[PDB]
Amino acid sequence: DISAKDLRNIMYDHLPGFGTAFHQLVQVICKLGKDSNSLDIIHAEFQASLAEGDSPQCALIQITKRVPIFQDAAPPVIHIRSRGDIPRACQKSLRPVPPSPKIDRGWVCVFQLQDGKTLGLKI
């Protein structure tokens, strides 16, 4: 069976740049997919979207809209020490956390900083 690491690497293979918000979205998709035994359907949706001619970015967003574990789901909370732990290419995508963020509305994750600060990653 495909593993979370395998799928992460497969998805990364299609993305430009490094440590971008889409890379973090792959991390989130793979974590939540692993936790709900859904990596196979996620991989299949990813490949099908690519096969129809969608960009890999569009394919990842479509996974957040078409795979049921992400539908109306809140972004996962990831504990980090400070803003510096977040990759450079993600920094401009960090935003104040809104009232009810949802993964399928583009809120990838919420970083909970050691000093109590909180930042959402937005696509």
Ligand SMILES: O=C(O)c1cccc(N2C(=O)C(O)=C(C(=O)c3cccc(C(F)(F)F)c3)[C@@H]2c2cc(Cl)c3c(c2)OCO3)c1
């Ligand atoms: O242990 C697993 O089986 C598994 C599977 C897939 C991905 C991951 N994740 C990681 O190993 C990991 O470093 C994840 C991150 O997204 C992450 C963690 C710390 C810091 C950062 C960073 F700040 F963006 F750099 C990202 C990432 C991760 C993703 C999510 Cl959504 C997490 C999480 C960790 O902990 C709480 O929720 C773990």
